[PDB]
Symmetry: D3
Subunit: 157 residues, 6 copies
Amino acid sequence: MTGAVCPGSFDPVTLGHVDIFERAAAQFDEVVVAILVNPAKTGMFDLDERIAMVKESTTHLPNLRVQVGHGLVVDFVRSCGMTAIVKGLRTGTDFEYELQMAQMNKHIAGVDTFFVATAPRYSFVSSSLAKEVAMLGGDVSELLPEPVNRRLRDRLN
Amino acid sequence: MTGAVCPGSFDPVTLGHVDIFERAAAQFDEVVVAILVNPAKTGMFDLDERIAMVKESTTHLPNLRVQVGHGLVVDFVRSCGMTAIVKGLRTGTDFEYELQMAQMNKHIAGVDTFFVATAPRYSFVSSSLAKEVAMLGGDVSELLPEPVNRRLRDRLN
Amino acid sequence: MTGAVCPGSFDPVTLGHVDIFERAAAQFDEVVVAILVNPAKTGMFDLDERIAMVKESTTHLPNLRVQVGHGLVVDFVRSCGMTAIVKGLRTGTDFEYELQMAQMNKHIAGVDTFFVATAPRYSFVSSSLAKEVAMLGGDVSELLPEPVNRRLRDRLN
Amino acid sequence: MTGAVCPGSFDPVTLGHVDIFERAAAQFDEVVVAILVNPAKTGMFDLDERIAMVKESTTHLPNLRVQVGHGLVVDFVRSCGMTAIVKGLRTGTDFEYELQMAQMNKHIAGVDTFFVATAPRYSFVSSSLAKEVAMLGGDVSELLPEPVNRRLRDRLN
Amino acid sequence: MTGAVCPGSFDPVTLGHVDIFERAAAQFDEVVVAILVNPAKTGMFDLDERIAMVKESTTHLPNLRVQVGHGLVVDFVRSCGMTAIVKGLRTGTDFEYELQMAQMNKHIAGVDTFFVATAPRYSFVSSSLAKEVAMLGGDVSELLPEPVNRRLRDRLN
Amino acid sequence: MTGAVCPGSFDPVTLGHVDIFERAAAQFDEVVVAILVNPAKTGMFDLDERIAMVKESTTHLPNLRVQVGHGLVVDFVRSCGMTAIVKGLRTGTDFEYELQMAQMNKHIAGVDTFFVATAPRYSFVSSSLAKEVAMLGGDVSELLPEPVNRRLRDRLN
Ligand SMILES: CC(C)(COP(=O)(O)OP(=O)(O)OC[C@H]1O[C@@H](n2cnc3c(N)ncnc32)[C@H](O)[C@@H]1OP(=O)(O)O)[C@@H](O)C(=O)NCCC(=O)NCCS
Ligand SMILES: CC(C)(COP(=O)(O)OP(=O)(O)OC[C@H]1O[C@@H](n2cnc3c(N)ncnc32)[C@H](O)[C@@H]1OP(=O)(O)O)[C@@H](O)C(=O)NCCC(=O)NCCS
Ligand SMILES: CC(C)(COP(=O)(O)OP(=O)(O)OC[C@H]1O[C@@H](n2cnc3c(N)ncnc32)[C@H](O)[C@@H]1OP(=O)(O)O)[C@@H](O)C(=O)NCCC(=O)NCCS
Ligand SMILES: CC(C)(COP(=O)(O)OP(=O)(O)OC[C@H]1O[C@@H](n2cnc3c(N)ncnc32)[C@H](O)[C@@H]1OP(=O)(O)O)[C@@H](O)C(=O)NCCC(=O)NCCS
Ligand SMILES: CC(C)(COP(=O)(O)OP(=O)(O)OC[C@H]1O[C@@H](n2cnc3c(N)ncnc32)[C@H](O)[C@@H]1OP(=O)(O)O)[C@@H](O)C(=O)NCCC(=O)NCCS
Ligand SMILES: CC(C)(COP(=O)(O)OP(=O)(O)OC[C@H]1O[C@@H](n2cnc3c(N)ncnc32)[C@H](O)[C@@H]1OP(=O)(O)O)[C@@H](O)C(=O)NCCC(=O)NCCS
């Protein structure tokens, strides 16, 4: 009964996120994707849309499920009966801040954090940058699941 | 008559800050903790509370005093008759930005900046992260002075 | 017919920027400085003032011209009939984010990004830090073109 | 079913290494410690003493075994029926390198690498630094397991 | 009129090196690949094979030539009638060093250095890692040009 | 009463080292330059010439003395009646390492390490790079004190 949580805001989910989902799914018996929305920061997609996009991109992963989190990621992790977090690393990641959170999460709840480097082809995509480029007419279709592409296309007119 | 200034917003002061205060105090004849509040950014604690918390955490350091700064840190430093700043380094610190400020401060006023690594046990605490975790019910009591813990507890109800 | 674009918000232009302009100008047949203003973020100087300051600082560079960009930097680059961007590196630069943008820009439009380290004397100046120090009465005159200094002086009273 | 390999030269094993072994053992069904032989550049302890030191230091982890490797780490991993490497991060880790190896290992054999931050109290110990300090008379006994301390003090008397 | 030098030991040349050659050849009138001889620390291939490998791998770039250098890279650059060095950035690059050399080269001869990020698919290959993996039986043929692969498989049979 | 140790191999001392000596001498009552002997890996200048070079380059600092050390830097520091090390940061510094040593030195003897950024004009010089360039005929005389320049030009004629 091994398990890991993949936390994030996923606004929207990218192929960078999916690559990490797939690696977590391959190495742990169970994997929970936790969508932790910021109560102060409203992004582009609403919670239901973010859930849909994640679920639409992870139908091929039987041991993975999507779930909404509130408050501490470690509280969510423990409520799943798990003690592990898996985080992706890419080009631009604030790794020092990821390390700070990792140590903090370990300190407050005994939760381990495992970092894994995203595949090179998906190493420069992030949610905020994909949105920025897309909303200015740039083609990021290869850097996002097709369901996400369909929805970004809907917001052109 | 050697002296160093430890500048910051201290909202709230952490055991990371105190560790740096103690090391500065051990190496310099006089040490001034400068609380430089951001006029645009309002945090959690008001200036009086921030002063109180710093003073409540530094009663054991005879050659240290707490003082409020306005404008340039270098203007505050020079007004204390000093030419040195001591800054802490921890897990997550934007060190490139600390370096930029250090060079700038040296350029504009001839003020030296000394960096020192915080003790490992207090290396992942920061004011903003401690607040975030605490306000979601997380236990950061070991990562803050007891007086600070008492005040964070008061803001639960 | 070689060419490079030097993009930025230049609010205001610094001697760090100029140093990069000069190096780009020395190595490419044509060089276009693209002023890409953020539609969400309003800074200190208006677009006309930013253009003036850049033009006032680059009269000595015959193969360089100043032009306003809208939307994607790569769209601006391609519209100049170019395939290259030149970016400066200094003390504090978020290099991981510069790398992310570089890879992204290459992916979406085949545009190459060339990075060059600014001269050490101008390695700690940035637009935001120069403004912060100046508006608190600090002397950054050596870290900015004289025309920029004149304008920063006008906003004291 | 799940498994991870913890590779290294372990000359000698530190409490930093053991911390990582413990994290891996808690999150995977099986952990294999792979002791890989370095080039002409040989070390203080021979292979048998290295094996024994790791073994005596990990008696509290029943799902962990120790094994020598002679070629590619990925070949070792695959021959064990696994597809994951777990590696520790400490102060002084060459991350740039670790990431290069991770990407290379993923490319040549499809093996994933997971990185974990070592506990702060054990974040500054490394085999080479421990050896250097110990040989010069310094006390690193709190940073190494007792089986290592025993063999270390026998070498210096 | 415009020109760039791409310096290195190229032992052997990788598809990471070639990617950079291609970027330079597209943006400058002339590119010179400078093969500089390392100290006593010699390598796998001799100078003539190194030259031939670079030559056979760059037949698709008519504005590129290959030349041996024996002293300072800046002396090579200047003797070629140029003032620019182009260097690739990959996962595992010692940037801290590259920047030091860039500043030193600028100081001693006024030579500019331009950095370019290698294509993601070729971002984890380096000469030394490719050699290590190949000698241990791993397949790095997708990361090296065929002229290098040919000479590499002849050395291991 | 206050004191700092500036440790190194100083082979040879650079104007980067001297900048740091000057910062330390201005902020502490006493500064001791500790010349520590490296392992089998010996250098260009012998110990006596190294001592003399540091001495002749620091005549303008009356509160600074020079002394050889043979073991742990912390043992040197403590035997001098001090508890502080001052170390310079330059372009190309291995910070990751410096921090590891700082934490280790604090752990084994309670000695604090203070880091200071070298002046920009002297931020790219290091002993090894200066030696490399000088031996190849390059002019590094502006980056080294004249006592070093004298002994350097006598070695190359
Ligand atoms: C959910 C959580 C893991 C963040 O997930 P996320 O939003 O998907 O994280 P991302 O991958 O998008 O990147 C982090 C974002 O924070 C920002 N960030 C980066 N460095 C930062 C730093 N030093 N300080 C604050 N924010 C930072 C970045 O802008 C980044 O967004 P962007 O790069 O896309 O513009 C985190 O907020 C969390 O755990 N929330 C629950 C509350 C909690 O437990 N907090 C305590 C953590 S110890
Ligand atoms: C007081 C001063 C030293 C900052 O102190 P501080 O607020 O305690 O600094 P902190 O330790 O909290 O960390 C810096 C904060 O700035 C932010 N920061 C980090 N990198 C940054 C960067 N690249 N650019 C802008 N802000 C940055 C961070 O969010 C961090 O807060 P957080 O990590 O807790 O979320 C500085 O603002 C100052 O000197 N103010 C006086 C005005 C002045 O002299 N300015 C000129 C400086 S050259
Ligand atoms: C114009 C452009 C190159 C930015 O230029 P710029 O504003 O002059 O950049 P700067 O040199 O001032 O520095 C970048 C700023 O972004 C911020 N920044 C730094 N790291 C960041 C990160 N990780 N994520 C988001 N913003 C970041 C910094 O605050 C910095 O400002 P500051 O350091 O002065 O406070 C970029 O916004 C752009 O290309 N815009 C056009 C739209 C586009 O093409 N976007 C797609 C890029 S792939
Ligand atoms: C065994 C292996 C994981 C290394 O483990 P290790 O020796 O315990 O690793 P450590 O972190 O203790 O030490 C790494 C050492 O290499 C050095 N290292 C760091 N950066 C390096 C670089 N750029 N190039 C080469 N070595 C580097 C460090 O100096 C460090 O030694 P130190 O303790 O003296 O600092 C690895 O060498 C390996 O996989 N070997 C098997 C062969 C193989 O698979 N090769 C191809 C891998 S893609
Ligand atoms: C030729 C030259 C550009 C180097 O090229 P190169 O060998 O292809 O460079 P690479 O990136 O492949 O390798 C750099 C190597 O040096 C090492 N390097 C990295 N950091 C270093 C450091 N701090 N100090 C010394 N070498 C370092 C790396 O370990 C790397 O080797 P690797 O592949 O085993 O990792 C350079 O040495 C040069 O200019 N030589 C001519 C002489 C000269 O001009 N000297 C003064 C320069 S300011
Ligand atoms: C003397 C001492 C401070 C080093 O000083 P130094 O030689 O002048 O330091 P420098 O910055 O000039 O050089 C550091 C060198 O080590 C190397 N260094 C950097 N990273 C390293 C690493 N990961 N592992 C080992 N050495 C490293 C660098 O390559 C650099 O050499 P360079 O100029 O060729 O780049 C240190 O070795 C010391 O304290 N010695 C005394 C013994 C002791 O106390 N040991 C335990 C310390 S915790």
